[PDB]
């Protein structure tokens, strides 16, 4: 063949197989992340797996804060994830400097995604093998959830997942939105945790998951403590 092995060249069917391989690179990590939106809150959950006891559990995280009121969860290569996180933080601060107001979540996602496009069009560099999911509150639009992928697609979502169990998780979430009644903050967090736990079969403990939330009442992105996570987990088991 040879139509793979370079991002620039098109297949005879015009598919650009290299970026599709970058999509597989996300699943190679073996972790899953889920994001679900609510009427007044947006949450991100992801597996936290510590391979060795010696590792400091505090340092390992896939949840990062792009700015005070935006948070992200990265899935894929850890290094590419950290690099994209840094680029996102730079883009947000530069937006604030130039335009005088906090970057919208959609525009941040668009900037990061079009950067991913310049990666998937120029020859020498490779697409970053990571996926981003951004959550924030916009005053006009309420909560928001968005996802960047290695291709440059940046579509917004009511709820999403990324990682190895993405298809199972989106099947689960699709059923839940179809039986739409609402999602308050507690139900939002419960839906996220139930989705992740059901698709993985994990039956989590508080250490195994890390959750981050935004709410219209408290717009700042915060990563909940193990105690708060256990509080939500116990509520799930009780009912």
């Amino acid at each position: 063949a040879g139509f793979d092995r370079h991002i620039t060249i098109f297949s005879p069917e015009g598919r650009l197989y290299q970026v599709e391989y970058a999509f597989k690179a996300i699943n190679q990590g073996g972790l899953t992340s889920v994001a679900v939106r609510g009427k007044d809150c947006a949450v991100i959950v992801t597996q936290k797996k510590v391979p060795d006891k010696l590792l400091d559990s505090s340092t390992v995280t896939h949840l990062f804060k792009i700015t005070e009121n935006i948070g992200c969860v990265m899935t894929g290569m850890t290094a590419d994830s950290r690099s994209q996180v840094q680029r996102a933080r730079y883009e947000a601060a530069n937006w604030k400097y130039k335009y005088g107001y906090e970057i919208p979540v959609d525009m941040l996602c668009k900037r990061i995604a079009d950067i991913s496009q310049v990666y998937t069009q120029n020859a020498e560099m490779r697409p970053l093998g990571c996926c981003m999911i951004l959550i924030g509150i916009d005053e006009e639009q309420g909560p928001q959830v968005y996802k960047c992928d290695p291709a440059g697609y940046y579509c917004g979502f009511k709820a999403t997942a990324a990682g190895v169990k993405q298809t199972e998780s989106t099947s689960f979430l699709e059923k839940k939105v179809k039986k739409k009644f609402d999602w308050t903050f507690e139900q939002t967090v419960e839906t996220a945790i139930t989705c992740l736990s059901t698709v993985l079969s994990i039956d989590f403990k508080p250490s195994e998951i890390e959750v981050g939330v935004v709410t219209v009442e408290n717009p700042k992105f915060r990563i909940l403590t193990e105690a708060e996570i256990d509080a939500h987990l116990v509520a799930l088991a009780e009912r």
């Binding site: 069917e13 440059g152 697609y153 979502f157």
Partner: protein, 229 residues
């Protein structure tokens, strides 16, 4: 052979085959339809979503470059956005220089020049997207297509994407120059109705129109009203 992989290499029989492959990438893209009515021009495309989870309001396949110009695409979504930003920038440069809204013909020339600019260098790939650029200038409608090759053509009506040949045949059967846009939108949704393989709804399609007023994306309620027929 070696002609297949290189972009700056004419194959034997003189074909730049990577560009043909980019056109094949366009053909895989979703259906898009453009019909130039006497008093307007309608751009329509399917916005079929993988799941209910997708939020339709987040992204649009039909975008305004200017007040009186808008365009739609079939092909690669990221490439579409690169060139839509570049098109908006080119139009604003024209407005700064001449203090007049850019003509549709001039804009399609400039964006096609950009698309050609990309094909020449080996380090870059062609844009795997084609566009239908519609506009109303000088009290006249316009419809244009711009391919990955960097070439542009002027169509009374045409279709891109999946089943574009069959859609074009359906159009040439159904097309009348005397059509008003009220009828032309119906013909466009029918042209797409040929090729969905699904039950079209207000969400599953995105359609926009241009006229003396200018380009606009008619709302989900509007397209529901037109779909009711």
């Amino acid at each position: 052979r070696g002609y297949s992989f290189s972009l700056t290499t004419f194959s034997p029989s003189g074909k730049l085959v990577q560009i043909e492959y980019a056109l094949a990438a366009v053909a895989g893209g979703a259906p898009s339809v453009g019909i130039k009515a006497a008093n307007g021009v309608v751009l329509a495309t399917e916005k079929k979503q993988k799941s209910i989870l997708y939020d339709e309001r987040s992204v649009h396949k039909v975008e305004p470059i200017t007040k009186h110009i808008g365009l739609v695409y079939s092909g690669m979504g990221p490439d579409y956005r690169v060139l839509v930003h570049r098109a908006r920038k080119l139009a604003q440069q024209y407005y700064l220089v001449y203090q007049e809204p850019i003509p549709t013909a001039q804009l399609v020339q400039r964006v096609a020049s950009v698309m050609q600019e990309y094909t020449q260098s080996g380090g870059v790939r062609p844009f795997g997207v084609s566009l239908l650029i519609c506009g109303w200038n000088e009290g006249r409608p316009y419809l244009f297509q711009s391919d990955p090759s960097g070439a542009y053509f002027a169509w009374k009506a045409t279709a891109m994407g999946k089943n574009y040949v069959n859609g074009k045949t359906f159009l040439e059967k159904r097309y009348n120059e005397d059509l008003e846009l009220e009828d032309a939108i119906h013909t466009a949704i029918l042209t797409l109705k040929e090729s969905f393989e699904g039950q079209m709804t207000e969400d599953n399609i995105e359609v926009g129109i241009c006229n003396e007023a200018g380009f606009r994306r008619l709302t989900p309620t509007e397209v529901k009203d037109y779909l009711a027929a």
